[PDB]
Amino acid sequence: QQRIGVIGTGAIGGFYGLMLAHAGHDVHFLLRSEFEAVNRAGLSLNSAVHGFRRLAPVQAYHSAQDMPPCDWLLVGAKTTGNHELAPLIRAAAAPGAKVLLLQNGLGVEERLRPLLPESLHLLGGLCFICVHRGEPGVIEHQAYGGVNLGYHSGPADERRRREIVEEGAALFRESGLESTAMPDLEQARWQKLVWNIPYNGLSVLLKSSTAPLMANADSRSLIEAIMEEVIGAAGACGFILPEGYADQLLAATERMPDYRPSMYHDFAHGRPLELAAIYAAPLARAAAAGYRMPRVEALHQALRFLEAQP
Amino acid sequence: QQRIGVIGTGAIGGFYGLMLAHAGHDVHFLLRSEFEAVNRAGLSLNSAVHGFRRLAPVQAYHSAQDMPPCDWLLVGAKTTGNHELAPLIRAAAAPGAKVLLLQNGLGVEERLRPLLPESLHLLGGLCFICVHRGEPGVIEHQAYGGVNLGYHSGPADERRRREIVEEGAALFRESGLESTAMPDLEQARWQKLVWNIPYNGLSVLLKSSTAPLMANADSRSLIEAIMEEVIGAAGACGFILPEGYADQLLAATERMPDYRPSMYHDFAHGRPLELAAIYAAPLARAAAAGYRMPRVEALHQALRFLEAQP
Ligand SMILES: NC(=O)C1=CN([C@@H]2O[C@H](COP(=O)(O)OP(=O)(O)OC[C@H]3O[C@@H](n4cnc5c(N)ncnc54)[C@H](OP(=O)(O)O)[C@@H]3O)[C@@H](O)[C@H]2O)C=CC1
Ligand SMILES: NC(=O)C1=CN([C@@H]2O[C@H](COP(=O)(O)OP(=O)(O)OC[C@H]3O[C@@H](n4cnc5c(N)ncnc54)[C@H](OP(=O)(O)O)[C@@H]3O)[C@@H](O)[C@H]2O)C=CC1
């Protein structure tokens, strides 16, 4: 039994902490705005995959300093707050703890590493899941749920790194989730950008969920074009992605239920968009490699304009 | 004294017909939805350039067949209706009349020519003007007003074509407007696309007038990038545009008052956008020349998506 801490208990943190808790793990949740309702009424899950689940009472905390030392810390905050998140991770971390970022974007682990003791293992958890927060304390899970883990940095040698990635994957596997050990976390993060770059921004820019974006031929063509820019940028930075990856990803999105990306909810609620990790970072990597992404560049500009307007 | 007919009496047709009428010309206005208010109360102009002007009574018509034969026909409809407009132009045209399209876009004259008798002179009038309709019968003119004329097709040889272009320019010059005879109408239309392609679409896509688009650094950079695509496409199709044209156009737009492009009003009022002439036509010309315009292509796709959404 690992002791798990969830740092940022939103849609992602709530889902994975609840799943792990349901599987017999000792899970401790750090909450912010919704601490009162969850501490009181608990956490509940509507899921088309796993059915209804409820955790009550919850081991809930409003301050990381109150949390006991945890062996695995699942970071479910958005990447926008990661700098301010580091002191909270450090406080809840047992010695040699594993820090696992359940976060989208590129360069996420690298930008956090200077704020974590080198004695902590820092891993990335790429989650392929359609989930959002409903009413407070209620998690709305529409599809998928798998987590692909990769190792960024920490005191482990290569052999130990693979063992630790497998330990994390086993945690999620024991809970009834799909989990995969990745050999190359950066490659995996580039792969995931092919979906998140078009769908997250375009859902805000065109105020639309996934199904209308796929059903209209102009947005569908635009999504495919953006995917090829991300695929081309990844290759230019030394990360070749599979043949016909765009067609595959587009097909999976057709099969997907009508879904509002996380960025859609952020703009709806006036929360800052994860532009830095999802757009700014791969655009910077692309320019360093001499590869231009005109549609992605323009999307990022449009989203920045939208965030500045009254 | 030329007899002038205005076919489509909106912001552009109202302005130029009124200006010409104020200068002593015999002007006859074809109106549609606003015929009742203008036939009754007349046409009035608030202008920061020319001050207030009013034409009352107006020679107003709801049917082109009622109009007398006109020597010059000023077409102020949007380009979306040009196919349906041709029988109206033919009816109001005196023998050998001059048809002058006060319309944005590319290939406008070419697409109309098959529907006009070869005995009519078909010219393009590129209007550089900030104008929109206010209340019915009221024209809101914020800045500029100049018209650059070019000859597309008709029974005139080169010498005669230049003479006729100069005759048109003189009409507007006599009315107190800036007017220029252009040697190459297609070149002039490509030039004008450099402004209309970014500003018309982006004002709809980002729901913004010109001043916020210029004041935000991300949209300003995006506008400049789009301009270079249009400039590059024009060159690829054999129409070299001047050095530093983008910087000049951007500077003029800074000097410009806060302006909502015509396309902004169209989307606000549920009217179809002039996508075919402003985006589809130059994109097709570019692809024929082997030159891709990724930002313009994506903007057109986004605007088409927006027009299809409920
Ligand atoms: N298929 C995919 O690609 C998916 C990936 N994601 C990604 O996962 C990450 C999180 O997404 P998501 O769960 O949907 O976002 P949410 O807003 O739903 O949850 C984020 C949680 O982190 C909390 N948080 C931030 N800072 C703190 C802090 N100091 N202390 C306590 N709590 C904090 C927030 O609290 P508070 O509510 O008070 O603000 C919030 O509850 C993102 O990077 C997202 O892109 C998300 C969904 C699907
Ligand atoms: N600086 C620039 O680039 C500028 C250029 N333009 C361009 O000029 C052209 C017209 O623009 P604008 O005046 O602003 O648009 P408006 O909508 O204001 O006016 C168009 C007029 O044409 C009328 N119309 C269309 N079909 C008919 C018909 N069968 N019979 C009678 N009337 C008809 C419309 O009548 P109804 O009202 O009933 O629909 C309308 O009054 C466009 O191509 C536009 O892009 C416009 C402004 C600035």
XYZ file of C-alpha atoms and ligand atoms in Angstrom:
716
model
C 0.000 0.000 0.000
C 1.521 3.241 -1.249
C 0.435 6.475 0.390
C -0.870 8.759 -2.366
C -1.219 12.532 -2.258
C -3.261 14.429 -4.846
C -1.993 17.993 -5.325
C -4.804 19.763 -7.150
C -8.085 17.860 -6.897
C -9.956 18.826 -10.034
C -11.329 16.665 -12.822
C -8.052 14.808 -13.390
C -6.856 14.695 -9.786
C -10.292 13.760 -8.505
C -10.688 10.968 -11.053
C -7.308 9.316 -10.560
C -7.214 9.783 -6.795
C -10.718 8.337 -6.521
C -9.862 5.405 -8.794
C -6.726 4.662 -6.769
C -8.608 5.050 -3.475
C -11.341 2.694 -4.705
C -8.591 0.100 -5.300
C -7.479 0.108 -1.649
C -4.776 2.787 -1.652
C -4.390 5.380 1.112
C -5.165 8.598 -0.771
C -4.929 12.132 0.625
C -6.477 15.005 -1.344
C -5.324 18.628 -1.309
C -8.214 20.875 -2.349
C -8.657 24.621 -2.746
C -11.956 26.294 -3.722
C -14.022 23.102 -3.388
C -12.475 21.952 -0.095
C -15.589 22.716 1.956
C -18.033 20.715 -0.166
C -15.699 17.743 -0.647
C -14.503 17.645 2.978
C -18.192 17.607 3.971
C -20.029 15.573 1.254
C -17.122 13.681 -0.310
C -16.161 12.882 -3.886
C -18.508 11.202 -6.370
C -17.977 9.963 -9.919
C -20.412 9.544 -12.787
C -18.564 7.400 -15.326
C -19.734 5.735 -18.527
C -16.732 3.396 -18.162
C -16.706 2.481 -14.462
C -20.229 3.393 -13.389
C -20.957 5.491 -10.330
C -18.308 5.695 -7.600
C -18.289 7.624 -4.332
C -15.563 8.271 -1.757
C -16.962 9.422 1.596
C -15.471 10.453 3.834
C -12.499 11.858 1.926
C -9.089 12.468 3.467
C -9.262 16.142 2.533
C -6.800 18.961 3.180
C -6.823 22.690 2.444
C -3.090 23.086 3.173
C -0.268 20.849 1.973
C 1.550 21.325 5.292
C -1.258 19.375 6.986
C -0.744 16.379 4.711
C 1.266 13.364 5.896
C 4.373 12.333 3.928
C 3.270 10.702 0.677
C 5.139 8.162 -1.442
C 3.443 9.152 -4.719
C 2.195 12.666 -5.441
C -0.276 13.035 -8.300
C -0.286 16.623 -9.550
C -3.680 17.444 -11.044
C -3.415 21.224 -11.130
C -3.318 23.000 -14.445
C 0.192 23.829 -15.627
C -0.442 27.571 -15.222
C 0.129 27.294 -11.464
C 3.135 24.967 -11.383
C 5.625 27.514 -10.007
C 3.339 28.250 -7.058
C 2.646 24.514 -6.748
C 6.238 23.447 -6.061
C 6.332 24.381 -2.329
C 3.155 22.334 -1.868
C 4.667 19.278 -3.570
C 7.843 19.574 -1.487
C 5.856 19.731 1.758
C 3.727 16.641 1.075
C 6.639 14.584 -0.294
C 8.013 11.704 1.734
C 11.762 11.126 1.270
C 12.411 9.827 -2.223
C 8.792 10.363 -3.242
C 7.596 10.041 -6.835
C 6.087 13.213 -8.318
C 3.761 12.445 -11.242
C 2.426 15.329 -13.347
C -1.002 14.511 -14.800
C -0.685 17.521 -17.065
C -0.782 18.388 -20.764
C 1.818 20.373 -22.674
C 5.527 20.283 -23.450
C 8.491 20.900 -21.168
C 6.271 20.620 -18.085
C 8.657 18.484 -16.035
C 11.727 20.467 -17.125
C 10.216 23.768 -15.969
C 9.278 22.273 -12.577
C 12.547 20.395 -11.894
C 14.504 23.441 -10.570
C 11.864 23.728 -7.823
C 11.984 20.086 -6.694
C 14.741 18.439 -4.629
C 16.899 16.217 -6.804
C 16.072 13.402 -4.356
C 12.501 13.273 -5.721
C 11.606 11.289 -8.826
C 9.786 13.496 -11.343
C 7.584 11.706 -13.870
C 4.997 12.686 -16.461
C 1.590 11.059 -16.692
C -0.124 11.580 -20.043
C -3.844 10.938 -19.478
C -6.065 10.089 -22.452
C -9.460 10.736 -20.903
C -12.661 12.729 -21.444
C -13.435 14.137 -17.993
C -14.582 17.401 -16.436
C -15.886 18.698 -13.127
C -19.647 18.794 -12.717
C -21.247 20.210 -9.599
C -18.753 20.614 -6.727
C -17.502 17.222 -5.609
C -18.901 15.503 -8.727
C -16.652 14.203 -11.519
C -18.117 13.681 -15.005
C -16.178 10.943 -16.828
C -17.322 10.340 -20.406
C -14.682 8.019 -21.888
C -11.203 6.417 -21.763
C -8.967 7.031 -18.716
C -5.602 5.519 -19.604
C -2.334 6.994 -18.313
C 1.021 6.684 -20.078
C 3.904 7.289 -17.664
C 7.401 8.511 -18.426
C 10.392 9.442 -16.294
C 11.940 12.911 -16.503
C 14.540 13.337 -13.757
C 15.603 12.196 -10.313
C 18.166 10.031 -8.521
C 17.539 6.820 -10.552
C 19.796 5.272 -13.187
C 18.228 3.926 -16.414
C 17.410 0.438 -14.963
C 15.861 2.006 -11.839
C 13.986 4.575 -13.994
C 12.249 1.807 -15.952
C 11.433 -0.018 -12.707
C 9.860 3.114 -11.212
C 7.828 3.836 -14.354
C 6.546 0.259 -14.149
C 5.692 0.716 -10.463
C 3.553 3.732 -11.328
C 1.855 1.944 -14.220
C 1.045 -0.956 -11.887
C -0.675 1.405 -9.435
C -3.117 2.467 -12.151
C -3.404 -1.063 -13.548
C -4.399 -2.400 -10.109
C -7.183 0.220 -10.054
C -8.775 -0.969 -13.300
C -7.171 1.601 -15.619
C -5.115 1.179 -18.768
C -1.480 2.113 -18.141
C 1.660 2.016 -20.286
C 5.327 2.491 -19.432
C 6.819 4.926 -21.950
C 10.539 4.812 -22.811
C 10.681 8.485 -23.874
C 8.560 11.045 -22.015
C 9.352 13.931 -24.375
C 8.377 11.853 -27.413
C 5.119 10.943 -25.675
C 4.448 14.606 -24.880
C 4.978 15.575 -28.531
C 2.575 12.800 -29.552
C -0.102 14.104 -27.180
C 0.321 17.651 -28.518
C -1.052 16.469 -31.878
C -4.469 16.154 -30.241
C -4.390 18.953 -27.676
C -2.997 21.711 -29.922
C -5.904 21.775 -32.443
C -8.785 20.654 -30.228
C -8.112 22.728 -27.097
C -7.584 26.041 -28.881
C -10.154 25.584 -31.645
C -12.831 24.644 -29.106
C -12.297 28.078 -27.551
C -11.691 29.979 -30.794
C -14.763 28.534 -32.540
C -16.747 27.974 -29.289
C -17.453 24.340 -30.146
C -17.125 20.850 -28.720
C -15.435 17.980 -30.545
C -18.438 16.589 -32.430
C -19.346 19.775 -34.381
C -15.646 20.326 -35.088
C -15.472 16.852 -36.640
C -18.828 17.087 -38.440
C -18.018 20.319 -40.317
C -15.693 19.720 -43.259
C -13.871 23.055 -42.944
C -12.933 22.677 -39.278
C -12.121 19.008 -39.905
C -9.695 19.990 -42.673
C -8.292 22.713 -40.407
C -7.761 20.250 -37.545
C -5.919 17.884 -39.890
C -3.683 20.686 -41.177
C -2.793 21.708 -37.613
C -1.982 18.081 -36.780
C 0.507 17.906 -39.652
C 2.236 21.037 -38.343
C 2.608 19.443 -34.903
C 3.749 16.164 -36.468
C 6.241 18.057 -38.624
C 7.494 20.116 -35.686
C 8.044 17.000 -33.563
C 10.094 15.440 -36.352
C 12.125 18.627 -36.782
C 12.961 18.502 -33.058
C 14.061 14.872 -33.382
C 10.865 12.985 -32.450
C 9.534 11.025 -35.423
C 5.910 10.120 -34.975
C 4.189 7.132 -36.615
C 2.977 6.925 -40.193
C -0.599 8.094 -40.651
C -0.847 9.355 -37.076
C -3.176 12.211 -38.046
C -5.697 9.936 -39.778
C -5.675 7.610 -36.753
C -6.164 10.436 -34.246
C -8.942 11.949 -36.361
C -10.664 8.555 -36.515
C -10.493 8.108 -32.735
C -11.997 11.578 -32.300
C -14.924 10.601 -34.535
C -15.521 7.595 -32.258
C -15.223 9.928 -29.262
C -18.352 11.257 -27.526
C -19.099 14.957 -27.839
C -16.465 16.444 -25.548
C -15.477 19.902 -24.357
C -11.684 20.127 -23.917
C -10.280 21.349 -20.618
C -9.309 24.658 -22.236
C -12.954 25.217 -23.195
C -13.984 25.070 -19.533
C -11.129 27.402 -18.568
C -12.284 30.149 -20.933
C -15.932 29.615 -19.984
C -15.005 30.166 -16.319
C -12.536 33.013 -16.833
C -9.574 30.862 -15.793
C -6.219 31.439 -17.530
C -5.544 29.171 -20.487
C -2.677 26.673 -20.540
C -1.170 28.531 -23.501
C 2.416 28.473 -22.212
C 2.742 24.686 -22.016
C 0.517 23.706 -24.953
C 1.405 26.442 -27.485
C 4.299 28.666 -26.398
C 6.671 25.818 -25.524
C 6.368 23.755 -28.756
C 6.408 26.941 -30.850
C 9.699 27.883 -29.184
C 11.120 24.393 -29.750
C 10.032 24.567 -33.396
C 11.682 27.948 -34.001
C 14.901 26.650 -32.439
C 14.791 23.754 -34.922
C 14.038 26.070 -37.858
C 10.523 24.702 -38.456
C 7.586 27.112 -38.704
C 4.020 26.194 -37.685
C 1.947 28.985 -39.271
C -1.488 27.696 -38.236
C -0.402 26.906 -34.664
C 1.412 30.251 -34.408
C -1.767 32.032 -35.516
C -3.986 30.011 -33.168
C -1.765 30.907 -30.215
C -1.924 34.575 -31.228
C -5.718 34.430 -31.525
C -6.048 32.762 -28.119
C -3.755 35.352 -26.522
C -5.837 38.131 -28.092
C -9.014 36.509 -26.766
C -7.595 36.250 -23.240
C -6.780 39.978 -23.257
C -10.156 41.177 -24.454
C -12.817 42.503 -22.015
C -24.667 65.551 -66.936
C -24.472 61.765 -66.854
C -27.516 59.842 -65.687
C -26.412 57.622 -62.794
C -28.137 54.507 -61.493
C -27.230 52.970 -58.135
C -27.905 49.218 -58.058
C -27.825 48.316 -54.377
C -28.192 51.375 -52.153
C -26.380 50.428 -48.976
C -23.462 52.099 -47.237
C -21.296 52.228 -50.367
C -24.049 52.835 -52.913
C -25.746 55.400 -50.707
C -22.506 57.290 -50.091
C -21.317 57.491 -53.689
C -24.754 58.086 -55.181
C -25.387 60.844 -52.645
C -21.979 62.423 -53.269
C -22.560 62.354 -57.031
C -26.109 63.691 -56.634
C -24.849 66.514 -54.404
C -22.506 67.492 -57.269
C -25.373 68.041 -59.727
C -25.701 64.608 -61.337
C -29.051 62.956 -62.088
C -28.937 59.948 -59.756
C -31.521 57.159 -59.556
C -31.411 54.741 -56.612
C -32.590 51.127 -56.629
C -33.408 50.057 -53.069
C -34.709 46.864 -51.488
C -35.464 46.478 -47.758
C -35.038 50.191 -46.978
C -37.000 51.472 -49.989
C -39.967 52.638 -47.909
C -37.993 54.789 -45.468
C -35.714 56.296 -48.121
C -38.490 56.896 -50.672
C -40.373 58.702 -47.880
C -37.699 60.471 -45.732
C -34.755 60.506 -48.143
C -31.051 59.824 -47.735
C -28.866 61.556 -45.142
C -25.127 61.439 -44.493
C -23.145 62.002 -41.317
C -19.548 62.418 -42.478
C -16.415 63.460 -40.610
C -14.941 64.379 -44.016
C -17.780 66.186 -45.805
C -20.070 67.119 -42.928
C -23.787 66.432 -42.967
C -25.502 65.931 -46.332
C -29.123 65.145 -47.153
C -30.861 64.185 -50.399
C -34.637 64.676 -50.236
C -36.584 63.790 -52.164
C -34.663 60.833 -53.581
C -35.295 59.341 -57.009
C -36.025 55.953 -55.462
C -37.042 52.675 -57.090
C -37.925 49.234 -55.740
C -37.673 47.574 -59.175
C -34.930 48.044 -61.755
C -37.500 47.807 -64.563
C -38.968 51.114 -63.353
C -35.628 52.887 -63.695
C -34.871 55.023 -66.762
C -31.869 54.116 -68.942
C -28.688 55.087 -67.104
C -25.289 55.955 -68.563
C -23.318 54.878 -65.474
C -24.467 52.124 -63.123
C -22.822 52.018 -59.702
C -23.196 48.552 -58.192
C -23.181 48.803 -54.402
C -24.568 45.379 -53.554
C -22.380 42.878 -51.791
C -20.705 40.404 -54.132
C -22.755 37.513 -52.714
C -25.751 38.560 -54.824
C -24.034 39.388 -58.114
C -25.567 36.538 -60.139
C -29.072 37.640 -59.155
C -28.017 41.261 -59.710
C -27.175 40.921 -63.410
C -30.774 41.099 -64.761
C -31.234 44.299 -62.751
C -28.088 45.877 -64.213
C -29.129 44.904 -67.746
C -32.573 46.470 -67.302
C -31.320 49.838 -66.025
C -28.477 50.069 -68.564
C -28.685 52.579 -71.384
C -26.996 51.431 -74.614
C -23.249 51.334 -74.108
C -23.595 52.057 -70.396
C -20.674 51.832 -67.974
C -21.096 49.272 -65.179
C -18.893 50.080 -62.172
C -18.608 47.529 -59.354
C -17.972 49.233 -56.004
C -17.137 45.857 -54.521
C -14.299 44.120 -52.685
C -12.716 40.808 -53.616
C -10.966 39.165 -56.549
C -12.371 38.053 -59.890
C -15.559 40.050 -59.298
C -15.806 41.507 -62.802
C -14.803 38.232 -64.478
C -17.574 36.290 -62.726
C -20.179 38.909 -63.711
C -19.094 39.405 -67.352
C -20.935 36.322 -68.755
C -24.180 37.903 -67.504
C -23.649 41.338 -69.075
C -24.003 42.223 -72.773
C -20.603 42.680 -74.373
C -21.821 46.145 -75.432
C -21.582 47.331 -71.804
C -18.326 48.566 -70.303
C -17.543 46.688 -67.081
C -15.236 48.444 -64.626
C -14.106 47.927 -61.045
C -14.199 50.665 -58.437
C -11.976 49.982 -55.431
C -13.249 52.209 -52.604
C -10.940 53.030 -49.690
C -13.501 54.273 -47.192
C -14.738 53.689 -43.637
C -18.528 53.729 -43.988
C -21.530 51.782 -42.726
C -25.300 52.095 -42.588
C -26.749 53.653 -39.459
C -30.485 53.931 -38.952
C -32.448 53.358 -42.184
C -31.691 56.113 -44.667
C -28.673 57.318 -42.648
C -25.087 56.766 -43.820
C -22.254 56.854 -41.264
C -19.012 57.948 -42.960
C -15.976 57.950 -40.668
C -13.005 58.490 -42.998
C -11.487 58.507 -46.517
C -13.760 57.904 -49.539
C -11.430 57.608 -52.520
C -12.236 55.353 -55.482
C -9.635 53.772 -57.763
C -11.173 52.740 -61.092
C -10.026 50.045 -63.484
C -11.421 48.607 -66.701
C -12.215 44.898 -67.004
C -14.048 44.229 -70.271
C -16.281 45.742 -72.920
C -16.242 47.081 -76.480
C -13.346 49.571 -75.990
C -9.793 49.276 -77.302
C -6.879 50.194 -74.989
C -6.953 53.966 -75.835
C -10.742 54.091 -75.333
C -10.436 52.020 -72.111
C -8.096 54.597 -70.563
C -10.405 57.414 -71.685
C -13.418 55.738 -70.064
C -11.549 55.067 -66.812
C -10.633 58.760 -66.769
C -14.264 59.726 -67.408
C -15.336 57.730 -64.362
C -12.570 59.179 -62.195
C -13.649 62.678 -63.245
C -17.222 61.997 -62.100
C -15.975 61.315 -58.572
C -13.407 64.121 -58.726
C -16.133 66.639 -59.636
C -18.025 65.503 -56.515
C -15.166 66.289 -54.130
C -13.744 62.759 -53.867
C -10.257 61.422 -54.483
C -10.163 59.304 -57.642
C -7.379 57.521 -59.523
C -7.287 55.853 -62.930
C -5.668 52.431 -62.526
C -3.831 50.781 -65.440
C -4.359 47.230 -64.115
C -7.610 46.375 -62.324
C -6.508 42.889 -61.251
C -3.294 44.256 -59.733
C -5.349 46.852 -57.862
C -7.717 44.154 -56.593
C -4.787 42.087 -55.292
C -3.445 45.199 -53.550
C -6.788 45.805 -51.833
C -6.947 42.173 -50.674
C -3.930 42.834 -48.431
C -6.183 44.948 -46.216
C -9.529 43.186 -46.562
C -8.306 39.599 -46.093
C -6.954 40.028 -42.516
C -9.232 42.787 -41.227
C -12.610 41.571 -42.521
C -12.256 37.978 -41.335
C -10.387 38.657 -38.095
C -12.963 41.264 -37.066
C -15.561 38.486 -37.218
C -13.343 35.688 -35.894
C -12.099 37.713 -32.907
C -15.254 39.905 -32.666
C -13.230 43.120 -32.704
C -12.960 46.421 -34.536
C -9.734 47.730 -36.051
C -8.370 49.641 -33.052
C -8.222 46.697 -30.584
C -6.794 44.518 -33.362
C -3.985 47.045 -33.836
C -3.455 47.708 -30.116
C -2.909 44.045 -29.161
C 0.545 42.810 -30.144
C -0.574 39.251 -30.937
C -3.345 40.212 -33.358
C -1.082 42.905 -34.820
C 1.606 40.299 -35.525
C -1.078 37.983 -36.921
C -2.417 40.702 -39.234
C 1.100 41.368 -40.530
C 1.707 37.663 -41.175
C -1.559 37.396 -43.124
C -0.581 40.455 -45.172
C 2.684 38.803 -46.209
C 0.759 35.735 -47.385
C -1.481 37.921 -49.556
C 1.532 39.882 -50.813
C 3.336 36.626 -51.576
C 0.296 35.134 -53.299
C -0.131 38.211 -55.507
C 3.503 37.966 -56.578
C 3.151 34.247 -57.289
C 0.197 35.044 -59.575
C 2.262 37.670 -61.401
C 1.323 40.869 -59.523
C 4.331 42.296 -57.691
C 3.294 44.681 -54.972
C 5.453 47.530 -53.628
C 8.309 47.215 -51.168
C 7.231 47.524 -47.547
C 3.539 47.512 -48.446
C 2.570 45.704 -45.236
C 4.294 48.231 -42.963
C 2.614 51.083 -44.862
C -0.851 49.512 -44.682
C -0.405 48.740 -40.983
C 0.625 52.353 -40.359
C -2.432 53.717 -42.178
C -4.643 51.425 -40.090
C -3.122 52.849 -36.899
C -4.048 56.338 -38.142
C -7.518 55.012 -38.983
C -10.445 55.605 -36.605
C -11.886 52.599 -34.806
C -13.744 50.866 -37.624
C -15.908 47.781 -38.016
C -15.318 46.165 -41.433
C -18.292 45.441 -43.666
C -17.956 41.717 -42.936
C -18.371 42.447 -39.219
C -21.785 44.004 -39.862
C -22.771 41.080 -42.096
C -22.154 38.503 -39.366
C -23.785 40.712 -36.729
C -26.937 40.868 -38.882
C -26.954 37.243 -40.034
C -26.155 38.200 -43.629
C -23.939 35.854 -45.677
C -20.256 36.739 -45.680
C -18.391 37.736 -48.841
C -16.149 34.688 -48.427
C -16.242 33.637 -52.089
C -14.782 36.857 -53.498
C -12.453 37.804 -50.632
C -11.114 34.362 -49.613
C -12.152 31.549 -51.961
C -11.090 33.307 -55.168
C -7.526 34.334 -54.151
C -6.988 30.965 -52.449
C -7.897 29.267 -55.734
C -5.589 31.573 -57.701
C -2.794 30.858 -55.215
C -3.179 27.075 -55.469
C -3.108 27.329 -59.267
C 0.198 29.211 -58.954
C 1.599 26.689 -56.459
C 1.690 29.144 -53.534
C 0.103 28.170 -50.213
C -1.409 30.699 -47.782
C -1.745 28.673 -44.560
C -3.085 31.477 -42.352
C -5.565 32.709 -44.976
C -6.639 29.130 -45.735
C -7.290 28.564 -42.026
C -9.132 31.875 -41.614
C -11.442 31.007 -44.507
C -12.096 27.597 -42.942
C -12.842 29.182 -39.560
C -15.219 31.710 -41.128
C -17.018 28.963 -43.061
C -17.365 26.954 -39.840
C -18.750 30.025 -38.067
C -21.313 30.647 -40.815
C -22.585 27.064 -40.488
C -22.977 27.061 -36.731
C -26.383 27.661 -35.049
N -7.535 14.091 -22.488
C -6.723 15.122 -21.935
O -5.802 15.587 -22.583
C -7.008 15.639 -20.543
C -5.920 16.366 -19.832
N -6.161 17.380 -18.860
C -5.005 18.145 -18.310
O -4.825 17.817 -16.752
C -4.454 18.904 -16.147
C -5.568 19.315 -15.080
O -6.808 19.351 -15.837
P -8.272 19.467 -15.101
O -8.363 18.490 -13.984
O -9.314 19.188 -16.107
O -8.450 21.033 -14.538
P -9.398 21.443 -13.251
O -9.566 22.930 -13.205
O -10.712 20.783 -13.375
O -8.616 20.923 -11.872
C -7.412 21.542 -11.510
C -7.341 21.498 -9.988
O -6.173 21.888 -9.564
C -6.471 22.787 -8.287
N -5.358 23.667 -8.023
C -4.541 24.494 -8.686
N -3.689 25.038 -7.809
C -3.984 24.549 -6.592
C -3.422 24.781 -5.358
N -2.331 25.611 -4.869
N -3.898 24.165 -4.279
C -4.938 23.306 -4.402
N -5.495 23.078 -5.619
C -5.014 23.702 -6.716
C -7.521 23.512 -8.670
O -8.270 24.054 -7.486
P -9.493 25.157 -7.772
O -10.717 24.451 -8.226
O -9.775 25.892 -6.471
O -9.069 26.136 -8.803
C -8.369 22.525 -9.424
O -9.257 21.896 -8.572
C -4.372 19.985 -17.237
O -3.038 20.160 -17.620
C -5.195 19.433 -18.390
O -4.718 20.005 -19.726
C -7.513 17.654 -18.406
C -8.713 16.816 -18.934
C -8.514 15.814 -20.112
N -12.947 50.132 -47.292
C -13.619 49.057 -47.940
O -12.986 48.098 -48.347
C -15.120 49.106 -48.119
C -15.728 48.227 -49.155
N -17.053 47.710 -49.064
C -17.518 46.726 -50.083
O -18.690 47.368 -50.967
C -19.553 46.438 -51.238
C -20.961 46.827 -50.593
O -20.664 47.090 -49.194
P -21.762 47.787 -48.190
O -22.361 48.984 -48.838
O -21.066 48.176 -46.949
O -22.938 46.651 -47.833
P -24.490 47.034 -47.422
O -25.181 45.820 -46.884
O -24.482 48.109 -46.411
O -25.258 47.550 -48.810
C -25.487 46.621 -49.835
C -26.773 47.051 -50.530
O -26.972 46.354 -51.613
C -28.533 46.044 -51.628
N -28.808 44.898 -52.461
C -28.338 43.663 -52.672
N -29.083 43.085 -53.621
C -30.025 43.967 -53.998
C -31.036 43.877 -54.928
N -31.492 42.846 -55.848
N -31.857 44.905 -55.125
C -31.692 46.041 -54.407
N -30.697 46.131 -53.488
C -29.862 45.089 -53.285
C -28.788 45.734 -50.358
O -30.248 45.893 -50.041
P -30.790 45.350 -48.556
O -30.451 46.337 -47.501
O -32.299 45.183 -48.640
O -30.173 44.040 -48.233
C -27.969 46.730 -49.584
O -28.703 47.873 -49.335
C -19.022 45.162 -50.565
O -18.386 44.362 -51.520
C -18.025 45.658 -49.529
O -16.962 44.598 -49.240
C -17.938 48.146 -47.997
C -17.475 49.218 -46.970
C -15.987 49.684 -46.937
